[PDB]
Amino acid sequence: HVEHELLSKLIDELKVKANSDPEADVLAGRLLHRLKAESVTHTVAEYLEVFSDKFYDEEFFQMHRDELETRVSAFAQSPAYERIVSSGYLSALRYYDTYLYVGRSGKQESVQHFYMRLAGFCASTTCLYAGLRAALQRARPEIESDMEVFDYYFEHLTSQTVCCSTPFMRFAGVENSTLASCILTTPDLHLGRYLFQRAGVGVGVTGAGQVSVAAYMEPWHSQIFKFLETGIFTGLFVPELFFKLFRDTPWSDWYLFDPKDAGDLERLYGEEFEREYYRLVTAGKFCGRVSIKSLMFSIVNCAVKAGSPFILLKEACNAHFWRDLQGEAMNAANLCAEVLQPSRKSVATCNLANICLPRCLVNAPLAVRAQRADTQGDELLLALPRLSVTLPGEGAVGDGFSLARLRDATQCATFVVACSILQGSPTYDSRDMASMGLGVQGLADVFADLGWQYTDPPSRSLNKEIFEHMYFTALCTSSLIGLHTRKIFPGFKQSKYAGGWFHWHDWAGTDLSIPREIWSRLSERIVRDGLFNSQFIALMPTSGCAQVTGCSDAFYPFYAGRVSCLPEALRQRYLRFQTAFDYNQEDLIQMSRDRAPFVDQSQSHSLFLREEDAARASTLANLLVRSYELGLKTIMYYCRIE
Amino acid sequence: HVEHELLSKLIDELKVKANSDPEADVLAGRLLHRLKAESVTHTVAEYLEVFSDKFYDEEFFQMHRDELETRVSAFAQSPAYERIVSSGYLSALRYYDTYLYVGRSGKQESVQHFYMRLAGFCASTTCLYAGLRAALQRARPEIESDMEVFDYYFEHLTSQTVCCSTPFMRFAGVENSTLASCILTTPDLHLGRYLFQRAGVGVGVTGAGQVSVAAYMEPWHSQIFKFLETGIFTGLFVPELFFKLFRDTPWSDWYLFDPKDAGDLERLYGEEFEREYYRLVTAGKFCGRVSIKSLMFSIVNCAVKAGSPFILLKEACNAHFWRDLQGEAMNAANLCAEVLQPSRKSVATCNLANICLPRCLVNAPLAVRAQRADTQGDELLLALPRLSVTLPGEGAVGDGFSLARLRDATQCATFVVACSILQGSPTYDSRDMASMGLGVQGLADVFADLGWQYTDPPSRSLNKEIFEHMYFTALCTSSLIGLHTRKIFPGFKQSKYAGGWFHWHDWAGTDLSIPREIWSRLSERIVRDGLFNSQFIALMPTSGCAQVTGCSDAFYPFYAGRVSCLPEALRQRYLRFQTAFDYNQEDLIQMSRDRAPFVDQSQSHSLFLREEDAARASTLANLLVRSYELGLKTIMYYCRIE
Amino acid sequence: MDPDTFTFNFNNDPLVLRRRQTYLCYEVERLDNGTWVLMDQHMGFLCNHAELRFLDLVPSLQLDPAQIYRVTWFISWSPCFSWGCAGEVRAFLQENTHVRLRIFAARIYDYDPLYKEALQMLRDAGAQVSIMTYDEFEYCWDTFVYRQGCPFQPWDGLEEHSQALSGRLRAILQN
Amino acid sequence: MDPDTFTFNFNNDPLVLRRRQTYLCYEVERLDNGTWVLMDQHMGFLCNHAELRFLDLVPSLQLDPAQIYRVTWFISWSPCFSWGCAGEVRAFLQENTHVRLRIFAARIYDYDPLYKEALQMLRDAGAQVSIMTYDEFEYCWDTFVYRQGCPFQPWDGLEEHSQALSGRLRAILQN
Ligand SMILES: [Zn+2]
Ligand SMILES: [Zn+2]
C-alpha cells in the first residue's frame, strides 16, 4: 500500500503550512479522511458486527439495519458529508482522535456511522421512553415512525445545527459513562467518585475552614489570600457589598471571617447579607482586617497574571434563580462559571448542547429537509416572526438569519439534552433535576457574515433576539416534554415559574421581540403543565465541539491575520474581522448584560484586554465594577491577555 | 519542493484506480488542481501582466481590473469553484491540457481566470456592439453597468448552465481564430483554407464525378459503392424513394447515375425527385443497375462494421428548412450530421453552445443569483409555466426540473452564441448568416436524478417540454437581438418565419406545452421584428464538455458498472442506470421524433445495438425504415456496437 | 438463575438504565400460626411482561383458598401502567383476597409515563411496594441465583441508588 | 503612416474586428479643366472620430470656394450614425456644395446599430461610398505609408472579404 505513505507525507506537508493557507487545511482534512477510509467501518452491517458487544441488544439498530444503511449511504453522498470532511485538518484530527469510537478489532467507526450512532441513541431514547416520542410528535406533527425520529435527529445533527457536548458525542450508546459534561458540588468538608470520571467539577470550598476542577470561595474567607495565589481553577462568588464599598469610599476596610463561625454569610445573600456582615463586624468576629482596595487589586493582579480567578456576582446568580434561595444561597459554579445550581444537598449536574448560529442563516445549506420550517406544530412558535428583520450590511454573505430554524435547532437540542439527561445521569437526583445548558457558537461568524462589527446596533439587536427566542423555545419545548412525560422537576411547585416568571421579569430596560401576549400564553401553559427542565440557557465556551464545525468559539468575538496591524486600505473592508481585544470591553459587557435577562443560568463572560491596560490594574477594576452595576452573573470568566 | 513529487505520485496512484472509485477521481482532480496552483496566475493583475500582449488594448479588463479581481476572488471561495475542482481527474486534465491558455512566460491561466476571460469576452462584445447590450438589458432589466453584464455571463458560465464550444473556450479573446466549431461546404469540385483550421468540416462530394472531415454523397451516385468502403467520415443524404422501395417491393432495382449529367437529382427533392428519378430511368441515363436490397444491406453492414456512414433523410432535412429549398436542395451536413444549411453558394458555419440540463433541476446549486428567476423582463417568458410538473418518481434526487432556469440558460446561451458569431465568424456571409446550434447535455442525468428510466412516459413528456421550451426561448431571444441590433439574417423576408412558422407546424401529432396563444405572439413579434439567427436548436454530441462538467454525453442515455450483468436484487434499484443498448431502439427513435419538431436543425441521433442483432444486418434496416416513417432528419449518426 | 445476569439486570445504577428486561423472582409464604413459612418447591424466577406471566402461573401453583398465602416479587423493574400490568395486578388482588403481594423493585420503571399512577394503584390494591436494599439483593443472590458457593459481590453505588429510589417511591406513595 | 499600423488597422478580416480604431487617409484633387489633379501638400492621414476631425480640419486647408474640390477618404471604418458622424458629414456637404466626398471604407462599422442608415444618408448627401479593393489598399500603402521602398504585402482573404463587404454595401445603398 504505497498510497498511504504518500497520503501521510502530503498530510504533513499541508498541515505544516495550513495556518496561512485556507485551501491547504481543507485539503489536509480531505486527505486525512481518505487515509483512514479503509480503517473505518463502511457499512451499517459492518458497524454492527465490529461493535456487536455494544449493539447486540440495541433494538433500534437491529430492527432498522436496512433503513439505517439507506440513510447513511444517502448521507455519505450528501453535501453535509462533504462539508464535514471539508471542515479542515483540525476537525478530522479531532474526529479520529476523540469522537470516533474504536472497537476491539481496531476498526474505528466512520463519521457517517458516528452521526448514525448519535441520532440512533437519541431516537432509541425517544421511542423507548414513550413520552419523549409523544412530546416530539406533538412538537413535530410529521414524525410517525421511529425511523422518522432518527431522520429528525440525523438531519439536525449532521447539519450541525445542534452541537452536542463532548461526553455525549463520545459515549452515546457505546459506554455507560455519564453524559453530563458539567458537575458542581458543595460538600460539607463523595467528591472522590466524580474526580475519577471525565467531567469538569466545580467545588465550593468556602466551608473548608482554618480532571479539571474549579474551586470557588467567597472573598470574606479567612484564607482568601492564600486561596488566591497558590490544574485547579479559582472562583470568587463576590458579594455586592464588595463592589459597593470599592466603588465609593475605596478607603473603607474589608473584613475576613473564618468558616468556624462565619455567622450566616455563606448561607444568605442580598440586603440581609449587608445586615449580617455588619452585625458580625460590630460583634467583633472578624479575623481579617484587610483593606478592600488591596483585596480588589490582588484579585485583579491574580486575574491578569493568569485566568485562574473567576468573578461571579452572588446577587445576580442567586436572586435570579427560579427558587427564592434567600435562606440558603449557592456559592459554587461549574468548571466554566456558567452553570448555577444549589449543590449542598446533592451533586448537581448539567447537560450541554450548543447551537451553531451560522447554520441559522437563510443561505446556509442544511441537511434539514425544506418541508420542516412549516408543519412546526407548536402553537407558540407558529406565531413568532422569522427572517429576523435587522437590515444586514452591504458586505453581508448572510441574508437575514432566518430565526425560525434557530427555534427548530433549539427544539432539537432540548430533546437531545432530555435524552442525555434521562439516559446518562449519574444520580437520580440529577436525573430528576434535568438541568439543561443551551449555549451558542458562531455568533461572531453570524455578525461577520451579516457585514457588521460585533458592537454594531444591528448586532446587538440580533443578539438580544437570538437569546430571547432560544430561551422562549427552550421553555416551550421543556413544558411540552414535562407535560407528555409527567417528569416535572421536583421544585416546580411553589417556585417562580409556577406563579408566572421568565427570568427577564427581574431586569430593567428589557425590550422583547415577543409581543408579551405569547409570553403570557407560555406562562399559562407552564403553570398548567409544568417544566421538564429546571435550567434552560447557559453559554458554554464550547472550545471542543466548535473545532469540528468551524463555528466561532461560543458567543465571543474572534480571538483565535493582524487586522489591527494591517494597512488602513485593507482595514475598513476587513473591519468586521476585528479581534475581541480590538472591540471596546464596555460594549462587550453591555451586550452581555443585554443578553443576560434571557439566559436563566450564567454565561462564561470573558474579558479581552491588551498588555497596555491590563498592566494598569485599574481598567480591569472599573470593568468589574461596572459589570456589577449592570447586574451580570459571571462578571469575569477569563481575563484574556494578548 | 517536495510537495510536487508527492502530489504527482498520489495523482498516479489515484488515477490508476479512479475507474472503480468515485471518491478517488475527485481527489485526483483536486490534487491535480493543487499541483498546478503555483504554475497558474493567481491574481487578475498577474493574468493581465502575463497575457499583456493579448489584453493591452482590451478596454474592458483594463478599466475593470479591480472589480474583476473582486469577483474572481469571490468565485475562488464560491461553491461553484469547489464543484468545478471536484469534477474529477479528467476535467482537470482537460483544463490544464486544452482549455487553459499558456502565455510566453510559461504561466498558464487559472480556472477562475479562464472563466473570467470567457465572461469578459462576452461582456466586452456586448458593450462594444451597443445593440447586444440593449437587447440584454431589455431581456434582463437588472443589468445596467458593463460589470453587471460580466456578472451575468460569469454566473451562467461558472455554474456551467451554459457550456460554450471548444473553439470558444480555447480562443475567446486570446487568439483571432475562428470561433465557429462546425463548418460545412459543398464546392463545385477554397476548401483548403479551412482544412488548415481546427474546426470540423463537412464536404458534399456528390458532384465529384467519374482535421476531421465528413464527406456526404447521395445514394444515387455512380461511385456510391466505392465511396461506402475505402480520418474522413462518410455521409448519405438518403432520399425518400430509397426507403419507399426498400419497405415494400424490396426486389425493386435501384439505379445509379454519374454526376456528369445526373439530371437534376442532386438539385431537387420531394415528389418531383421521384418524377425526375423515374424520368431519368425511363430515358436510359442510369450508369448503375444495383438491387436496392443489396445497397441497403451494404450500407447497414458498413455502418455496423464502423460508424463511418451517416444516414440523413433528404426529405426531412430540406422540407423543414426555413426556406423552400425545393429548387435547390442541400446534400451535406457538418461533421456530426447535426447542422443543416445550404453550402453551395458560400461556406456555411455554425456556432454551438450546450446546456447542462442537470443544472436546470431545482435542487442543483447554481452560481446564478436567486434574484434572477424573477425580473425576467421578457413578456413571452414570464408567462410560461415553470417547475415542469411531471411527477418525479420515488427515487428522485431532483425535485422538479424547474424549466424556468432552463429558459434563462437558453437566453444566455443565445447571447453567448451571438457574441461568438459577431466576433469570431470567418466570413461576412457566415457572420450575417448567424447560425446557432443550441444542444443539450446531461438529459440522461436529468432522467436518472428524477427517478425515471429514459423510456418512461414522464421522461418523454419532459423531453418534449425541454426541447419545445428551449426552441421557444431561442426564437424569442434571437428576435429580440435582431430587433435591437438591426442585424436580421439576409433571407428572413419571403421566408417561412416571416409568414408565421415555427418548424413544428410541419409535423403530425405534436402536443405543445405552450398554450398556442403565446406562440401566436411570438409569431407576431418575429414578423414585425425579425430574427437575428437563422437556425436555433441543433443537437451536438458535445463529447468534450461532458468530461469537464460531468454532465452526461448529449441527449443520449448512459453509454460511457454492468447494470445488465448484475444480480436481480441490485437491478431494479439501479434500473435507471441502464445503458443505451439496454433500451429498446424503437423507443429511442420515437423520442427522437418527439423532440424533432422543436429542433429546427438536425440531431446527432446515434443507434445503440449489441452484438446479437447488429450482426443480423436486418434489425438495423428495420430501425432505419422506422426512422424514415417518422420523418427524422438524421436517421443514424453512429451505429454504436457494444 | 445463572450469574452475570442477576448483576446486570438487577443493578440500580441510572447509567445502566440503557438495557431493559424484567426478571421477577418469586417465592410464596404460607401464614402458618402467625409466622410466614417458606418452601423450596415454589421458589423460582421468571424472564421477559413478567408480571402477567406470574399472574398466569399463580392459578397453577397449587393455590389453596382456605390457607391465606403471601408472595414476594423481587422484580427488576417496577410494575408499569400503560401496558396494563398494574391493572391486572390490582384486578388479581381485587378478587383473590387471600393472597398478599410484596414487591421489591430494584429500579423504578419510569420509562412508562404513568409509573406514578401504577405505583399508587398498586399501593391501593393492598400490596406494599418497596425498593431493594442490600439485604434483599444478597437474599436474591443466595436464593435464586446459581452462585455455586460464590459470595455476593456488591456493585458501586448500591446504597446511594437504593436510598434515592426508596425516597422517590415513598414520595410517590404519599402523594 | 507606418508599417504594422496600416496593415493592422486596415485588414478587413472579420476575425480582426476585435480591435477597432478609425484611421482616415485623405487626399484632395482639384478639378482643373476636366481632370482631377492631386498635390502632395494636402496628402496626409488622421488618427482617432477621425471623420469629424477631418470635418474641422477642412476649413483650414486653404480651401478656395471659386474652384470646386474633391476629397477622398481612405477610412478604415465606415462612417457611423448614432455618434452623429454621418449627420456631420451630411451637414458639411449640404452647405459646402463645391466639395465632393469619396469614401473608401476598409470595413463596415456595423458596431453602430444604424450603420445602414448612416450609409444611406451619406449616399443621399451626394458622396458615393465604396469598399477598398486591392488597388485602393496598394495605393494607400505606397502613398500614405512610410514604406521606405518595401512593396505591398497582401493579407490572406483580402479579395474575398473586400468582395463580401462591397456586396453588403451595394445591397444597403439600393435598399
Ligand atoms: Zn409491565
Ligand atoms: Zn464616427
Residue numbers in the entry:
A (entry chain C), B (entry chain A): 6 to 194, 207 to 227, 254 to 273, 284 to 613, 649 to 730
C (entry chain D), D (entry chain B): 193 to 240, 253 to 379
The authors write:
A recent example is neutralization of the nuclear DNA cytosine deaminase APOBEC3B by the Epstein-Barr virus (EBV) ribonucleotide reductase subunit BORF2. Moreover, we recently discovered that the large subunit of the Epstein-Barr virus (EBV) RNR, BORF2, interacts with at least two cellular APOBEC3 enzymes, revealing an unexpected role for herpesvirus RNRs in blocking antiviral innate immunity. The seven-membered APOBEC3 family (A3A to A3D and A3F to A3H) of single-stranded DNA cytosine deaminases elicits broad antiviral activity, often resulting in lethal mutagenesis, with the archetypical example being HIV-1 hypermutation (counteracted by the HIV-1 Vif protein that targets restrictive A3s for polyubiquitination and degradation) [reviewed in (13–15)]. Here, we report a cryo-EM structure of the large RNR subunit of EBV, BORF2, in complex with the A3B catalytic domain.
However, expression of BORF2 in 293T cells with an N-terminal maltose binding protein (MBP) tag substantially improved solubility, purity, and yield. To form a BORF2-A3B complex, BORF2 and A3Bctd were purified individually with affinity resins, mixed together with excess A3Bctd, and isolated as a complex by size exclusion chromatography (SEC). Two-dimensional (2D) classes corresponding to what appeared to be dimeric forms of the complex were selected for 3D reconstruction and heterogeneous refinement yielding a 2.8-Å map. Therefore, a focused refinement around the BORF2-A3B monomer was performed after symmetry expansion that resulted in an improved reconstruction to 2.55 Å. The structure is composed of a dimer of BORF2 monomers, which are each bound to one A3Bctd protomer. BORF2 adopts an α/β barrel RNR architecture resembling the large subunit of all classes of RNRs. The majority of this cone domain is absent in BORF2 including the ATP binding residues, and instead, the N-terminus adopts a helix that mediates formation of a noncanonical and novel dimer. This dimer is driven by a leucine-rich hydrophobic interaction involving two α helices from each monomer (i.e., a four-helix bundle) and electrostatic interactions including residues R39, D26, and E8. In particular, L1 and L7 of A3B are sequestered by multiple interactions with BORF2 including contacts with the novel short-helix insertion (SHI) and with an additional helical loop structure involving residues R484 and Y481. The net result is a high-affinity interaction that effectively blocks the A3B active site from binding to single-stranded DNA and catalyzing deamination.
